[PDB]
Amino acid sequence: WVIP
Amino acid sequence: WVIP
Amino acid sequence: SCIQFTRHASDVLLNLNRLRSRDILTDVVIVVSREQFRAHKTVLMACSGLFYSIFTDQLKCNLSVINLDPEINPEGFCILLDFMYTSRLNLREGNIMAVMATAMYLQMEHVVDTCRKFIKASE
Amino acid sequence: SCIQFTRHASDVLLNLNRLRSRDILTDVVIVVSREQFRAHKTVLMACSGLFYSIFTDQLKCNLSVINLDPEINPEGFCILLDFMYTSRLNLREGNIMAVMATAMYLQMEHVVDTCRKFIKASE
Ligand SMILES: N#Cc1cnn2c(Nc3ccc4c(c3)CC(=O)N4)cc(Cl)nc12
Ligand SMILES: N#Cc1cnn2c(Nc3ccc4c(c3)CC(=O)N4)cc(Cl)nc12
Numbered sequence: 001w002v003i004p
Numbered sequence: 005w006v007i008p
Numbered sequence: 009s010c011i012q013f014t015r016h017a018s019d020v021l022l023n024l025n026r027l028r029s030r031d032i033l034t035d036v037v038i039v040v041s042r043e044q045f046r047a048h049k050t051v052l053m054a055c056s057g058l059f060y061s062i063f064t065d066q067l068k069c070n071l072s073v074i075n076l077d078p079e080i081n082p083e084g085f086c087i088l089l090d091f092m093y094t095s096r097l098n099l100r101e102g103n104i105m106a107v108m109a110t111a112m113y114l115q116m117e118h119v120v121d122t123c124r125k126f127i128k129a130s131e
Numbered sequence: 132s133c134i135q136f137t138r139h140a141s142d143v144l145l146n147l148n149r150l151r152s153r154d155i156l157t158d159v160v161i162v163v164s165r166e167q168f169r170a171h172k173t174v175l176m177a178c179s180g181l182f183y184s185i186f187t188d189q190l191k192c193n194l195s196v197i198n199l200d201p202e203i204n205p206e207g208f209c210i211l212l213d214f215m216y217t218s219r220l221n222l223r224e225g226n227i228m229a230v231m232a233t234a235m236y237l238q239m240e241h242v243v244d245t246c247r248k249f250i251k252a253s254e
């Protein structure tokens with residue numbers, strides 16, 4: 001999971 | 005395009 | 009010896025979400041209490057262990073309407089359906105419990121994982 | 132304020148290709164001379180300007196069989212259909228002209244681009  |  | 013186009017899978021998913029927004033080739037309505045959500049069975053199966061089981065069933069595969077358990081929260085379902093079609097999860101303090109419960113029911117393991125990690129960090 | 136799962140779009144595409152291999156929820160047969168290819172209309176539209184035009188048409192959207200131009204090469208179509216479902220393009224010296232001609236007909240601009248670049252490098 002990432003900060004887009 | 006890339007070499008996978 | 010294949011070559012691979014890095015952005016292809018994301019471009020496909022973007023166009024599947026455009027089809028959903030325009031209600032093109034949607035073949036099922038998911039009923040969550042008083043709310044209805046139109047979707048493509050193939051995308052639902054590709055994202056969820058529950059829908060994969062439902063739509064591989066020789067009788068349920070032909071249903072145009074699927075009713076979810078009355079304990080399922082419509083907003084939590086809406087957030088997860090948006091995630092299915094975009095890879096983006098609108099996870100907030102106010103919705104995390106509903107999102108995690110819905111992801112457990114839908115059998116969306118990666119969403120469950122992260123909800124668990126975000127909850128553990130706040131305790 | 133969304134979070135994003137990096138591998139989600141690729142995981143969706145992998146499961147759409149699994150559905151295609153098992154012939155689950157395929158809703159169209161593409162006829163290319165003597166050969167037939169089963170696919171999902173939603174994936175075809177998401178990958179190709181030609182199929183996007185065909186399946187948004189108020190009459191053609193309901194067809195179970197689509198016949199392509201007799202000049203289209205079945206192997207070239209097979210390679211492009213595999214690309215649609217995997218992001219991987221089996222581009223070879225022996226098939227590049229057929230792949231490029233098929234990609235131009237199918238209106239798959241990124242494939243056309245690369246075929247053009249690979250041909251320019253060999254001349
Ligand atoms: N054919 C086919 C096909 C279509 N969909 N699909 C799967 N869909 C799925 C099944 C379980 C889970 C998820 C997705 C996300 C998750 O957390 N669990 C799996 C397979 Cl092995 N195959 C297929
Ligand atoms: N709704 C919808 C929807 C479904 N599919 N789709 C598009 N599919 C497409 C159209 C043109 C081209 C390609 C894909 C690859 C290419 O080279 N050209 C576009 C839009 Cl703007 N929208 C949609």
Ligand SMILES: [Cl-]
Nearest residue numbers: 116117118119
């Ligand atoms: Cl997931």
Ligand SMILES: [Cl-]
Nearest residue numbers: 239240241242
């Ligand atoms: Cl393309």
